[PDB]
Amino acid sequence: GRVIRAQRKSGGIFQAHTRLRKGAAQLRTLDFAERHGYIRGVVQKIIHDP
Amino acid sequence: NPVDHPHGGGNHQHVGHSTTVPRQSAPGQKVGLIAARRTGLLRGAA
Amino acid sequence: VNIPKTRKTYCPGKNCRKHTVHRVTQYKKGPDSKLAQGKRRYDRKQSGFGGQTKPVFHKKAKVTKKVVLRLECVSCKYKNQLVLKRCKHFELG
RNA sequence: UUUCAAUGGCCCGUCUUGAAACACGGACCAAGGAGUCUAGCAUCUAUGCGAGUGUUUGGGUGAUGAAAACCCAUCCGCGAAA
RNA sequence: GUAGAGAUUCUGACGUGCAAAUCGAUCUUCAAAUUUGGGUAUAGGGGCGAAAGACUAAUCGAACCAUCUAGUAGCUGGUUCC
RNA sequence: UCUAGUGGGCCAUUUUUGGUAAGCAGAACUGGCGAUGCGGGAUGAACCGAACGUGAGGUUAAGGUGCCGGAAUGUACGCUCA
RNA sequence: UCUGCCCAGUGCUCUGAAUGUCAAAGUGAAGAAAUUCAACCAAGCGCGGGUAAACGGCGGGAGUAACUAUGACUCUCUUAAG
RNA sequence: CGAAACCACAGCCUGGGGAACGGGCCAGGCAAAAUCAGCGGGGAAAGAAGACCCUGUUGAGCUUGACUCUAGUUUGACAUU
RNA sequence: UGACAUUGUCAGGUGGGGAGUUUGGCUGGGGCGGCACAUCUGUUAAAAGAUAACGCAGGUGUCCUAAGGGGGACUCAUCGAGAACAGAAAUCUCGAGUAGAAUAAAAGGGUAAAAGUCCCCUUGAUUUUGAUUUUCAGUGUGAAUACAAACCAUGAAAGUGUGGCCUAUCGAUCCUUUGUUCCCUCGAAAUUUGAGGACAGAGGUGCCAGAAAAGUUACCACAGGGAUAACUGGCUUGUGGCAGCCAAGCGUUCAUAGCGACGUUGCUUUUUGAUUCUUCGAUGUCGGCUCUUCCUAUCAUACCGAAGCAGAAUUCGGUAAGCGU
Ligand SMILES: [Mg+2]
Ligand SMILES: [Mg+2]
Ligand SMILES: [Mg+2]
Ligand SMILES: [Mg+2]
Ligand SMILES: [Mg+2]
Ligand SMILES: [Mg+2]
Ligand SMILES: [Mg+2]
Ligand SMILES: [Mg+2]
Ligand SMILES: [Mg+2]
Ligand SMILES: [Mg+2]
Ligand SMILES: [Mg+2]
Ligand SMILES: [Mg+2]
Ligand SMILES: [Mg+2]
Ligand SMILES: [Mg+2]
Ligand SMILES: [Mg+2]
Ligand SMILES: [Mg+2]
Ligand SMILES: [Mg+2]
Ligand SMILES: [Mg+2]
Ligand SMILES: [Mg+2]
Ligand SMILES: [Mg+2]
Ligand SMILES: [Mg+2]
Ligand SMILES: [Mg+2]
Ligand SMILES: [Zn+2]
């Protein structure tokens, strides 16, 4: 037999379509301020992520 | 067709053997309901 | 068939070249040594890749083996072998 | 030699029990086109020598001109015993 | 319904063709799972597949090129003068 | 002594078995064809006669002698009208 | 709008209480030693539980009706469920 | 102006026998130059070493609780320690 | 997180995901079936020997320590007549009794002071060699015959006995395994383990002169085969249909107006079948449409014959295929 579809999903045409994505969603690198106190940030944008 | 998939082929569209396949199946035979504890329509679960 | 446990027959042994009494038993194959050259050769051949390297009998029939009588001269310790026709049943004495 | 008359004459090759076959190949002509050479073995024949036989693994006349001819030692093969 | 994209029927034309797939009429779709240029990725037991064993340069139930290779053939054909 | 081809047969007479039967299948005996031309049976592998170097003459076999066609529209006695 | 019954079979899944078997390695004994003989061990395993919008099942076997076979008739097993 | 397929040799019928449906063989019917346009009876017309079937100690694609293996995977021993 | 894990090596399990390969023969095509694949008896078999079919009727791959070997004694299957007991010819007795019984299993052959039955003793169902017969290549295997050298059994003895009264009942190489010897070898020399040999057997190969082996292709390939099927011609007629002869009869009465059994002689078949002679380097395949021609086994049309008033209706009856259908 031939290589089944599930076995072909290893890269290539099955990679994620990521051109329209602005960045990974991440917490913030755990640093001194967060370990011991707090740090303030301001929400600049709320955006749709394709 | 059988060349394409373990489910392929036959003079009717049917699987042939059970679709619950073992956890330690090789790639290319690990298709269908993998290592299923049970199957069928559950009536009350937890 | 029924075969007496004792029979008086010619003894081919060098010290008793005459008719003497013998104790009769059925012959059974011995237990297949691992040191026999053919087994050493077969084991060496079977190692490595290539799979089964020699024929192996997958069937069996004709379970009527020829009965072989082992005749032991009572006093001389001399043993002789006698072959009988095939049969399904055997009993000594 | 051509032609006529009288009498006879089916299309070759092939496989086949059997081919003119409604079996296959063949439109025509030229040129090309298929049992070889080698390591063995067996019988038969010829030749040399014969209880022996085999100079060419080698070495020499050798340099002139030398892939030849010609010469020469020890082994060895086969044979002389099963 | 037009451009575009298709290809149902005539089982029409053609069928040593205009053409190794075309021509006419008819027909399907025509603002989206739409059509398409260029760039780019996936390569042969591999790819790619809204799945027909389809498609992968007129090649696909495993492409194309060279080599192993003068592959083997208990089979077909041939096998040359009196 | 060494070695080739062969290891699909087939036809007839006579003896047969199987089969409803068969231009059928299978055996027995001999003669044949295959490998056999020639005269005869209009025709025809096997039936009849006869087996073949190139020719002259003679005579035959099987079969013929109204014409085709070489050879008595011969002889004798009957039968027969379709 | 419904999605019935069946977990016996085959799959899947969870058990270590089976140590029940058992490789390699290691441990004990005999031997001069190769080695032999014994126990010991994992998983897999036999069991056991679950599982059908898993594969599937929701009757089967049978001997016998005028060529043979026959499914007429003759009978049961029914079983996981009928 | 100008191909091609195809082509053993060819080309009028009936009957016979015959590899059992002949253009050629045997017996008959017959038989007269050179040609044009059509036609679809025949040439068992052409095409393609039957694609059906069987045989071959010839394959391939596919399947599986066939035979023999194998990536992987799982468990143990030993080393890392 | 942590000396675990990972990694390396080896081991056990799992592993159509993947690889390689195999998946008998005969055969009235192949398949299915069967086994005619190793063998026996009667027949086919044509009075020597040989002789085929998936011809016919039957057997066999066992069984037996006696159902083998020797000796002795006796005679069987049946029939008849008596006695019992009570049908029962169970038993017992006497006559006749050529085997009509038995002899393991098929059939054929053989056998009567035995080869059958009973009894007594036994292990010749043993070791060794060559010769021979059958199948036959005059190879193997199987089976069998006559001897020889031993050792035995039995019998008073002559003798008989090397399995089964005769004709069937079975197995190479390699490997393993067993038996056997004051046996040979392990190649620098020894001893002891272990291994290897020579000789005689057994493991088992029934596809029986002896591979280790599942399917599918409705996607298919190649070499071929008319040695071989469907097709295609041709042949055959078991079926069926039709036509004669026979005349018991139906037909109030007259056996054949018209019907007409049991038999018997023919024709045809467009029926599948049978066979396998042509065709597998290829003869396009049903029906319909179209179109022509031929046959007659005549539906209609022409002319004729017989049964009863006409009228008709039947025998289309007899000629006859011109012309329609
Ligand atoms: Mg598959
Ligand atoms: Mg002529
Ligand atoms: Mg020939
Ligand atoms: Mg010819
Ligand atoms: Mg031919
Ligand atoms: Mg040919
Ligand atoms: Mg040609
Ligand atoms: Mg030339
Ligand atoms: Mg068209
Ligand atoms: Mg060549
Ligand atoms: Mg080649
Ligand atoms: Mg004349
Ligand atoms: Mg012709
Ligand atoms: Mg061909
Ligand atoms: Mg495979
Ligand atoms: Mg054989
Ligand atoms: Mg063989
Ligand atoms: Mg299909
Ligand atoms: Mg099919
Ligand atoms: Mg398909
Ligand atoms: Mg033929
Ligand atoms: Mg032929
Ligand atoms: Zn002794």
- Report the C-alpha gap between C6 and C9 in whole angstroms: 10
Which residues contact residue B20 at a Cβ distance below 8 angstroms, ignoring those fewer than 6 apart?
B32, B33, B35, B36, B39
List, in sequence order, the alpha helices (H) in C14-60.
37-46
Beta carbons within 10 angstroms of residue C52's beta carbon:
7
Ligand 7 centre distance from Cα of residue B20 (Å): 64
Q: Do B31 and A4 touch (CB under 8 A)?
A: yes
> Under a CB-based contact definition with an 8 Å cutoff, are residues C93 and C4 in contact?
yes
For residue B23, the CA-to-ligand 16 centroid distance in Å is 52
A6 vs B contacts (CB less than 8 Å)? 27-28, 30-31
The end-to-end CA distance of chain C, in Å, is 10
Which technique was the structure solved with, according to the deposited record?
cryo-EM
Name the residue among B26, B19, B13, B36 with its Cα closest to residue A7. B26
Resolution in A: 1.9
Chain B residues at the A interface, defined by Cβ less than 8 Å, are 2-6, 27-28, 30-31
Residue C19 CA to residue C4 CA, distance in Å, equals 16
Nearest CA in chain A to B2: A1
Quick count: other Cβ atoms within 10 Å of Cβ C11? 21
Strand E nucleotides within 7 Å of a protein CB: 41-42, 45-49, 51-53, 61-62
Residue type, B11: N
Alpha helices, DSSP H, located in C18-93: 37-46
Interchain proximity A4–B2, CB inside 8 Å: no
In this complex, which of A1, A3, A6 lies closest to B2 when CB atoms are compared? A1
CA distance B28 to C10: 74
Q: Compute the distance between CA of residue C92 and CA of residue C87 in angstroms, rounded to an integer.
A: 14
Cα of B17 vs centre of ligand 20, distance in Å, is 21
DSSP category for residue B26: P
Do residues C29 and C47 make contact, with C-beta atoms less than 8 angstroms apart?
Answer: no
Q: What beta strand segments (E) does chain C contain?
A: 2-3, 6-10, 19-26, 66-73, 79-86, 91-92
